[PDB]
């Protein structure tokens, strides 16, 4: 009767289904997979990447950057929504092979430093190569790359360092306000009376209102299905996409229903 | 015309004036200096230290621990109010010479990891040996050592990771509620429109209310003069000490007056 | 045609076969598994652990410590042979649950900091929760715990920070010289012309001579079969154990034969 | 009788005397000060900096990079001889303001991570802002930037991670072999029987022979006076410069004389 073997982080096949660069705005592209969002922003002074997906997506992220004309030494900054392996996986490998710098808040930095281990709810089950944050950003701080400004909005809940990123792009000259907000879900979490997260409910409630007030003409999420995106249908990908109000209110209804069924 | 030399962190002499262990409660002692608070809590399973003072106070903190009968291997945990050199200085040396573990939040951990460098308001002017945090604590989390529970209360403002620690001790059997709250000052800070701290005012206002609601029969601060303590007069040290209400309201009046004179 | 799933570090069942504490000397015990060595040294001032095994062995290491009468707060120091997941796995969890400090050289520390990721030969295939080294030791440095001195001997090869630990114990008063040397194997490594390790051959040759000259009356290795130990037969576990000379010369013959078959 | 104040790292004025970019080869420039070497290598794919000097030289290093036409985002890599404050000072600030990556060995990385604190011989006396190493290099490893290859040669002694860097440049088409070797001095060190460095003598002796065998047509050192350079006289700066043989043999004579006077 020996000890159990180690279990590997296994996800659905659609999360690992590679796709071609899909354009979001004049300077914004989707270079992740069918069910995982990885946003690339091309500026006059380099590129910016937001999230990366599963750890084995590093080679795919570099190939689509080459398709857009972004050499590895042109990737300047890496921004993160939260430091889970399904979104910050290939960050450590991308830093070695691109020379880019990582910007994140203190909570995402300490979670990225230990590779997702010692998670508040998952423990050491979902881990990935660790990476060090190069610049610590605060709530409301602005990050400027090539004339494009990225504003961070802390929305703690899914992770303590969950962050929504906003910036103003253009769509054939006409301006567009992009809001890439993090997941508002609490999958299998203990909500009431969590010793590792005593203020989890208060953080979620304050995060629901934060998403509602984000300046947003076009919302994206780390998982496209959460905001009713569909990367597979190309030009119709953002047709049925939700607003910030509809995304936050739909997640809060699921939160209260999950919080009510935990009391039972 | 050469470049300027490096300037050393020089403080008042009363900050470095060593004193004997002054008793606060049955299990709580003051082992710092006349104008710097370093609290020792002796339990049945070891000791707990809260803050340390200037970096050159390491030898003094160990001598007073020996006076109380606490061997270096008996110091179990190190708690921090905030990670400035005048309070987290000898932490790196204390870890090497005691085998203790450091518990702090994510913001204090990342500031302790770079030794106070790259400060939001002071830059690299006030630095000290860096130390790594061993356990990350959240807001409201409980730390239990030898049957004594320490509850963390985040009060961001002076530093993003400023933390107030509360625990229930006894005074000859009779219970006492101790609240060791951090400094609420903003010395020379840019309050309105700080690019390194855009939500500084909102964090201070939410911290004022946090201190007022702390369960406290006896308040202590990293600087004794902030709460009208006087470690030099021995038995009369806590005579004119302020309450949590009086400490927060007095700091908020100084904050609003300083915030008003910044508009000019 | 999606991307491949993540593969889990799967080892033989005998590596995860728990066993009872087997005594080596008066103060030395084997508390690992049948095919993985985890040595515990009990002193008057606490305990010392050398290696831990697979990451899922943390609970087993704590149970055998309780069998020997070693509370979690009594584990003082953790020493490592090398920072691979099959020997430094549960180190991160053991630090959180015991308050112990980790001592290792600079090469083992940087490999332990990134959880075995970015390995010189294995890449990100074999990973484990990361841990931070608390004390950096040099070649020939002495570590003293409870009157028992541990001397480090750098033997680079298997990993750049591979370390052999030696100490003098007793066997019913009569002294015994224990040498816990690391693995000298190079499983699947590129030996000649490795860009990640240009001096790999010179490091192995200098490590062969280092093991031969270790003061040793009783040799142990991270894998018991490497030194012909057999933890399952209890009192006869060290019967057919090899000497330091026989262990180094046998590994060098396998190294030269492997180095010769790489030229082909 | 209070505790002593903190003392600042104060050096000679000539170390902080700024100078204009002095050309060494077609692609190599000296952009440090009169008595501190900071080498810039301009390639087709960016620039490479070797050492930086005192921590307050960050602004000077950026101004001379602008004089050579190197924007902050064009500095690709930072290489270090050793991690003392008089040569790795502004590294932390240069990383934030340039987006460059730092490459160093494991010993220099762990010393750079704690900002020179806990030095083997100096303790916490000479400290500087800490920085994290992005890429770990081994002995003999090659670093290629813009077609120019940098080979690392470990020469432990002054620091455990002391490193000599070599590369082949041109001088009007004609090739030149540059060797930037680290200091071989042991200022005020305990050489025989150092508990923090038991193999200090063996490391120095093996480092003397390493410098002698470096492929070098033109030698530079972190301090120009060590190799008889004189940055002030412009075109005659390398006139009386020493060879690798003359530099190593002169330092070994001073080492043996210092080692002999320690026995007394
Ligand atoms: C940790 O990764 C998530 N979960 C998992 O992958 C699996 C799990 O559910 O435990 C394992 C998670 O964060 O819960 C990720 N996250 C989201 C999300 O939208 O947040 C969705 C949808 C599920 O997959
Ligand atoms: C960084 O250390 C403080 N300031 C200084 O020591 C000096 C400064 O004022 O700049 C330097 C600070 O935090 O401002 C410390 N802190 C408090 C406090 O009560 O917070 C009081 C009182 C001043 O001394
Ligand atoms: C990384 O762990 C080792 N290998 C593996 O576990 C597997 C592999 O062989 O790749 C994976 C290794 O270090 O090669 C370990 N180490 C030793 C050793 O004795 O060094 C023996 C025996 C094999 O198992
Ligand atoms: C730590 O910086 C050095 N020393 C100092 O700056 C001062 C000291 O001597 O203690 C303090 C040192 O390393 O010894 C530096 N290094 C060298 C050298 O050439 O190595 C020379 C010459 C002296 O200045
Ligand atoms: Zn997630
Ligand atoms: Zn997710
Ligand atoms: Zn302060
Ligand atoms: Zn202060
Ligand atoms: Zn191994
Ligand atoms: Zn192994
Ligand atoms: Zn030096
Ligand atoms: Zn020097």
UniProtKB/TrEMBL annotation, chains A, B, C, D:
Entry-linked PANTHER family: METALLO-BETA-LACTAMASE DOMAIN-CONTAINING, METALLO-BETA-LACTAMASE DOMAIN-CONTAINING PROTEIN
List of residues binding Zn(2+) 2: 86-87
GO biological process, one term: antibiotic catabolic process
Source organism of this protein record: Stenotrophomonas maltophilia (strain K279a)
SUPFAM superfamilies cross-referenced by the UniProt entry: Metallo-hydrolase/oxidoreductase
GO cellular component: periplasmic space
Catalytic reaction annotation: a beta-lactam + H2O = a substituted beta-amino acid
CDD domains, per the entry: L1_POM-1-like_MBL-B3
Cofactor(s) demanded: Zn(2+)
Residues of the Metallo-beta-lactamase domain: 35-223
UniProt-recorded name of the protein: beta-lactamase
Principal location: periplasm
GO MF annotation: an example: beta-lactamase activity
Family classification: Belongs to the metallo-beta-lactamase superfamily. Class-B beta-lactamase family.
